[PDB]
Write a protein that binds this ligand. Sequence first.
Ligand code: MMC
Ligand SMILES: [Hg+2]
Length: 162
Amino acid sequence: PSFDIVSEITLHEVRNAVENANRVLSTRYDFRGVEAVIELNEKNETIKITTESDFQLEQLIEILIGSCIKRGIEHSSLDIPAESEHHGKLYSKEIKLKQGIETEMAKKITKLVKDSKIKVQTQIQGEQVRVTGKSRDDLQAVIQLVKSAELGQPFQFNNFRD
Ligand code: MMC
Ligand SMILES: [Hg+2]
């Protein structure tokens, strides 16, 4: 048998979170008279945040995170750069939506499996990790293992095949 490890982001839920975050943002006493933009590029899978200083960026980030929590979206699905791009008077950050599993994260998954000694095979393909084993009880252990760890982005488990 097998199962797929996946990392999917429901954009629908994300657009919802960004709307909430713009409503909070428009009532912020400390942002009155201050440029501050929180936009979603649904085609690019990016959330662009722009304001007048790195501090204020941090402040926008807390809003964002504060909106995922309200929408029960896991914040770690956001890939937020450490540095800001400074343009004239403005500073911004392109925040990436973690849609799927890139090789780097897949290798952290595959590595964890090797280390757990569970007798299952891993195939890094597409944007997922397929876990194949003789034993369903082992496959379940794998699920608990990956759930327990903090590799860095949320995972889902589907396509259980016999
Ligand atoms: C974005 Hg929350
Ligand atoms: Hg989010």
